[PDB]
Amino acid sequence: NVPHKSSLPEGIAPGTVLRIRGLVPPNASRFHVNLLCGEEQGSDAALHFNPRLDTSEVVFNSKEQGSWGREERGPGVPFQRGQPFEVLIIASDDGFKAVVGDAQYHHFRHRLPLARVRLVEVGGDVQLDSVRIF
Amino acid sequence: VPHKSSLPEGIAPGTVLRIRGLVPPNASRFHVNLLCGEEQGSDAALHFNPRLDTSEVVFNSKEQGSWGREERGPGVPFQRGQPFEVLIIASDDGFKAVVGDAQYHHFRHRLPLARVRLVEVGGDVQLDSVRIF
């Protein structure tokens, strides 16, 4: 399972959509979508979106100065081992909207300034069919 | 069956309209409108008009009964008989129209986003889902 990692040197603005399509492997534990503020390991994360099949939860968080913030959890787990999925992460002036399947799943208010985002990473236990940034 | 639904407080950067459907095999043309009201030929902040009969996709606005300058996208990323997915994505500068897996055209705003009040989808199109995110 090849991870995705791509630079956003120009940044992301309100009205940016990240579309992720793929499949949860039948033996999956967890996977993640990070919007990061730099290339280096331990860089701050404006958004860490972490569907957790092993603990039946989807955790949202940020990271600054090597420390994770307050966790937010979405309602239920709209993911299943062995099943394909589609996620939109939509940036607005107020935060990130996570859409899974046909419904908004959770809204994550900005903690870091949106202007600090310059990298998108998708990895973990996930088979990626397509990642695109519009 | 056409779609028509209200956006009573307008929209904002980060508003996404997702349309999934199918172009009938004898289709001539269909439309996606973002309108600023309900009565009249209300002002159109966005008129997105795939035209299978004339092989063009036209974008325009309408204000006080008059159409703006037409913009056309590159090619026609729709086909008679084929299913499609469109995203119309509002930013502060304009609408990003995504068709299939690629941005198709960027339409800079002529009307303010706050004035949008209605989404209408119709014409020769079969609609599986229309969602505003």
Ligand SMILES: O=C[C@H](O)[C@@H](O)[C@H](O[C@@H]1O[C@H](CO)[C@H](O)[C@H](O)[C@H]1O)[C@H](O)CO
């Ligand atoms: O069960 C609740 C805990 O609060 C748990 O969530 C935390 O897990 C980390 O959470 C991070 C984002 O918060 C990130 O995903 C990292 O990978 C996870 O180890 C703890 O540190 C380890 O128990």
Ligand SMILES: O=C[C@H](O)[C@@H](O)[C@H](O[C@@H]1O[C@H](CO)[C@H](O)[C@H](O)[C@H]1O)[C@H](O)CO
């Ligand atoms: O190139 C051809 C013309 O410029 C043509 O495209 C215009 O057609 C209208 O275009 C509107 C959007 O501009 C909208 O689709 C409307 O319904 C259409 O009648 C003309 O006014 C028709 O004489």
